[PDB]
Design a protein around this ligand. Sequence first.
Ligand SMILES: CCCCCCCCCCCCO[C@@H]1O[C@H](CO)[C@@H](O[C@H]2O[C@H](CO)[C@@H](O)[C@H](O)[C@H]2O)[C@H](O)[C@H]1O
Ligand SMILES: CCCCCCCCCCCCO[C@@H]1O[C@H](CO)[C@@H](O[C@H]2O[C@H](CO)[C@@H](O)[C@H](O)[C@H]2O)[C@H](O)[C@H]1O
Ligand SMILES: *C(=O)CCCCCCCCCCCCC
Lengths: 119, 88, 178, 166, 170, 78, 104, 111, 55, 66, 157, 126
Amino acid sequence: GAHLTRRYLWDASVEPDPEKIPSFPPDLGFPERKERVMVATQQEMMDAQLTLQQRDYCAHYLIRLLKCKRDSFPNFLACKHEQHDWDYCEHLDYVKRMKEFERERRLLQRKKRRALKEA
Amino acid sequence: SDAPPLTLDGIKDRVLYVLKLYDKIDPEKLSVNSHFMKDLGLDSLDQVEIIMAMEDEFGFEIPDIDAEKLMCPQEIVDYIADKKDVYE
Amino acid sequence: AFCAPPAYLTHQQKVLRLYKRALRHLESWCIHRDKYRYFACLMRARFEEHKNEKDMMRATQLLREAEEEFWQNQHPQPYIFPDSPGGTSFERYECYKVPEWCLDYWHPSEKAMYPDYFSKREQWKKLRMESWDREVKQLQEETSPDGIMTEALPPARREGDLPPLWWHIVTRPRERPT
Amino acid sequence: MNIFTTSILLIFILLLSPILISMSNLIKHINFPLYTTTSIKFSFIISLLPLLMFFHNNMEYMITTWHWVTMNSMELKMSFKTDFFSILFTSVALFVTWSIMQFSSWYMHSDPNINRFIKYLTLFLITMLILTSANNMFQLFIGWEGVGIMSFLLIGWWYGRTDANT
Amino acid sequence: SWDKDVYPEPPSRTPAPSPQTSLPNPITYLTKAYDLVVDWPVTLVREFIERQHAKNRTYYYHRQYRRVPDITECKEGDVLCIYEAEMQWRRDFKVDQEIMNIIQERLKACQQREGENYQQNCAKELEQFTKVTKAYQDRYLDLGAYYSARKCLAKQKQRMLEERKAARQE
Amino acid sequence: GKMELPDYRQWKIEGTPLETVQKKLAARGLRDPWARNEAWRYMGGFAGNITFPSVILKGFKWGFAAFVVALGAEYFLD
Amino acid sequence: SGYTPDEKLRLQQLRELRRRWLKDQELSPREPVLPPVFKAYRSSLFAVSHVLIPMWFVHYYVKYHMATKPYTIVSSKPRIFPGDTILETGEVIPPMRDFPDQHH
Amino acid sequence: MLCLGALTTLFTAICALTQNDIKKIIAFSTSSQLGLMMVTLGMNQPHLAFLHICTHAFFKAMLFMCSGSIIHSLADEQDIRKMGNITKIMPFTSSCLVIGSLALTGMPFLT
Amino acid sequence: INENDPDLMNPIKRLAFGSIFAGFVISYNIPPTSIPVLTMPWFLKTTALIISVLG
Amino acid sequence: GVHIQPRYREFPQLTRSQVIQGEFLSSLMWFWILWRFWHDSDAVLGHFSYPDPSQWTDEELGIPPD
Amino acid sequence: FHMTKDMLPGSYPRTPEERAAAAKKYNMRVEDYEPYPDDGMGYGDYPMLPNRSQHERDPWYQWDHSELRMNWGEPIHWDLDMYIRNRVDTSPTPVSWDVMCKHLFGFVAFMVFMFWVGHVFPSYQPVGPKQYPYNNLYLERGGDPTKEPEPVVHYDI
Amino acid sequence: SKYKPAPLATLPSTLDPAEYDVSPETRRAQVERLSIRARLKREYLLQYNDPKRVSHIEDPALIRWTYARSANIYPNFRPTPKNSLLGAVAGFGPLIFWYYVFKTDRDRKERLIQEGKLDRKFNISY
Ligand SMILES: CCCCCCCCCCCCO[C@@H]1O[C@H](CO)[C@@H](O[C@H]2O[C@H](CO)[C@@H](O)[C@H](O)[C@H]2O)[C@H](O)[C@H]1O
Ligand SMILES: CCCCCCCCCCCCO[C@@H]1O[C@H](CO)[C@@H](O[C@H]2O[C@H](CO)[C@@H](O)[C@H](O)[C@H]2O)[C@H](O)[C@H]1O
Ligand SMILES: *C(=O)CCCCCCCCCCCCC
């Protein structure tokens, strides 16, 4: 993407380091930032036998998809809606991760701006 | 597999067939015993192409040491018959 | 495969072998028959322009330069007929080419399943045994005085004589044995 | 877990019967290539049941059929890992092999040793299923080396050809 | 059967089932056919066999070995006493091997049973395997092909003397 | 039986790509004496052209025909 | 050049013998002298011998020699979802929370 | 695994572009698809690499079957330079050959 | 040329069906495993189709 | 096995079966491709919209003013 | 036995009459015959034949030893078993040995060098790290239940 | 252009200058070589086709080759500075190298065990 040809072939101080995210304190810019909410209990994910990769903030939608698949058997085409719900939740989660990358890119821009004024 | 076995008359027909499609030979004066050099007036370079056309026709190679001696259509027919164990 | 090679190749033999190789590697490059026919005729014209070279020393030099040219324009992976040396079916049936002397060990219960085949086989064995002494004598008689020798064998000159050393040629396994 | 376990074990039994028949005098009174294709065909059909029960409940199994030898504090047991990877590979491999074995009847019709060719393909399939269902590395190494030997024998099938043996 | 205390198994917890679709479940019908064609005749054959067994009921006993003096109580060069003590130690060493096998068997069964939860729900079996492995290493590690009660004792005394030295410095 | 070969007089390079090759050779004073030996590959049932779309789109017509009939069912069962 | 007149003669004599040897390889009508039900039924009878009978033996071994020994058949646990009922006990799993719903 | 797979998937794709034996082209196709399985394993996607084993088994076996169908009919000829026009003279084998090639190349909704 | 034997046509036909439908049937029956990334620019989503067609 | 007769230098005679079976499977491939692409086009063209990062307001991202 | 000492390999030939007797022993011409250098490595008078594999013998000739592509009676190369057609091939190649070695190791070196480049300039998407609940699944990953973890808190952005 | 021969990729005959030499000295050698081959071929074939042969054909060339590569080796060995240096290096060289690999590695492993920093966690079989 464009982000790669900026970090290389250009300056990098204003571009995020993909492993060093979030670099800045979480409250910076958010007054009462709300903690992310998790619908599914630890017991529910354990009982549904979700893999640790699958035990993220969308596990509640995964649990209904698995539940529907077991009930709808042998009709394996009957879970289209639940699959869509799980996919969409994972899509929003992915955008959330895109926001964090953009947030750091802008904060590093601000750091470079306000550092120039200081000296 | 699905191909029929070769026959002495079948080989002869296809050997003369290939030669009848060679513009440097008049079909009418061609017989099984027509010597390529003497009777038909072809040089040695021509005889190389006649053998090369025979290999393509039957899908198998004739080594150079054996090909250089095949100077009439009956020699070619005999050679193919002995290679492929044709006997009648 | 049927004729033994000579001590050396004459200049004509070497030229005609290069001609066959050159066309065959051209065919591998061209693939399409119309394209191959076009370049096959162009190739023959190059061998013709020097056909009547009477210098010899120039003819030998022309052979050198063509062979050097062939090696550079060689197809890396030329077409090979399936049954030819290097072909995919080469020696594919050798595991099925059982020699005839194996039948001498067949059990009588095995031989009893082909009573007619093993009667004819006896006639061929009787024919072989009677002819051997004459065959040996003919080769001894026809040895040249000067040591120069070749692998070519003589025919049977007299009547009722079989050509010397015929058994391994006549009775060899079929190309497609089974 | 009795029907599931029986199905996994029955697949191996069905694939051994062509091998067993080869050792008897019965092989020359039957159409062996046809018999072996049917054994594999049925074995694929049987393999569809454990495939269905897994697609339903997604339950995974560790099955031990035989205790081979104990080396002090190490027990070697013939045991089977019947999980997602093993159940689905068995059904796919048996289906493909069913096509290959039927095709071999037409393709190798002229080979005088068609029966041995069919037998070798069956042995390869058995060693490949040992390889993909093994629960321990030693059992896996049996299948790992088994397919190597069967591929060697099948690559060099026309053994009078120098290039095949190379 | 077997001892549920030696080879513990958690109780099963199988759901309802609660099918939604109207299609028939092929596994359900195949199991009913299987339970009739296959399971039922096999049970009759087994019940016949068990009936024959009860008419010829014989018994066998687990052998009991009384303890003999340990190698610690044998005078050196006393081959009669060393022999009995050494034979006792070989019997115990063998039984230790099977205790290791039981603990590994529990560990393997629990991992399979727990599946994706094994990293959390196998803590007790993994800790017992860790403890019982430590104890095994202390008794038997590095004795060599000629392991024996005398070498085991020498290995223990070497460890005890080091433990004592470390404690004394404390 | 005994295979009967087609009459050899029919293999004529007129209208085939081999005629184009004969034109090019005739410019420089050459001709191909074997051109009729190849003529069977270019005439008869082997005459024509095989375009890559025709190989890929084999069966597209009835595949698309069946597609709308099946689509007609779904817009009626619902 | 072509065959010498001697090479021509030899190949003719071998050709006569070889073609006679090859003719001799043919079998007579009596050779080899060997000493002396609908479809789907054939599919049925194969099933009984090569599915039913082995399945009786395999089921017997699995039921009475493997299922009677500890840890020989170990399954992973079935998935339990919110709202199920467990047959062994009868307990009902509490439902999940509310998210609340969302729309694509 | 990622870099080993990627090197194999490219190296054996280059080799296949100029091969003339029909069985050698399909062989190098296999090594190139195995390289892609190794790349998938290097990305920490074990279940995707396994799902490619199962799908690959179908169209690759068909490709070999269809070439064996052609090799058998053309008298054990494996060189593609002596084939041609198989789409018309062997309609069934050609149709399955094209189906298999479209599945290999990622034609949508095939295996 | 003869491609009419049932021992040739039926085995190939069985694998032609697998080469059309097997992927779909397997994909919708296997349990969910790795979470796929279904958010990306259009040129990353259609990269496989574009380079295949270009080839 | 139908015993097709061999042919010399001419296009052979094709049986109805090999033509119909070859044509049926090709048609089945194209029915499936069209039927699936009609119902699951997003699987090829993508389903969820890809957001444009630059058009996210500083208020969404919690960027304090300089 | 048939092999007398005069028919078997011997010591290095020291005189031109011994060279001639050795050549006759091995069915060679005196001008063609030559032994290995006198190094005391055990070759004796065995002929030093050219180092060509049997791949280069005429594959159309009808050799007496068919697979070996040798005729009966002709001297056998010292390393025949290394040069059989199942083993080492010395036959001419369309490309020079030096050119193949340069291209092969040129290709390998280039790809290895430039995997390293791809390592220090990786490809990634403009996305933040994946987030997991419950202190990053501390209990599920096997963490000790007794000891309290270090809290890991994720926010809504 | 030009082809450069190597020991494992030899010169083709067609590119060999000695294949195009027609001097009567060479042609006499080539004819002499064929006479040897032809006489050997005749002797072989007379044995091969003889209908009274009951056993395989003895092969004196093969016996010489196997003899040359076994019994004839030691009588024709001469200790030279090159033999002696090669024998000592090949015979003892690898032995000394591998001694230091195993000795160095095993010394370190023992060093860690004495002072407790070798992680023997589940190792109970050896
Ligand atoms: C819901 C699933 C739907 C599955 C659909 C299955 C449809 C089956 C259709 C079978 C078609 C058989 O019909 C077949 O049509 C083709 C047209 O291609 C004809 O074929 C003819 O015309 C075509 C042009 O299309 C030429 O390429 C071909 O060489 C020629 O023979 C066949 O002679 C006829 O037999
Ligand atoms: C892996 C096993 C290792 C095997 C041994 C490897 C080391 C080999 C090198 C040994 C070096 C000594 O090599 C020595 O060389 C001299 C050189 O003349 C030989 O000497 C030889 O000629 C002298 C005359 O000068 C004779 O007296 C002697 O009997 C004869 O052998 C010795 O016999 C040999 O022992
Ligand atoms: C930036 O997003 C890095 C991702 C890697 C890009 C590799 C090239 C993919 C080719 C896409 C086809 C373009 C069609 C317009």
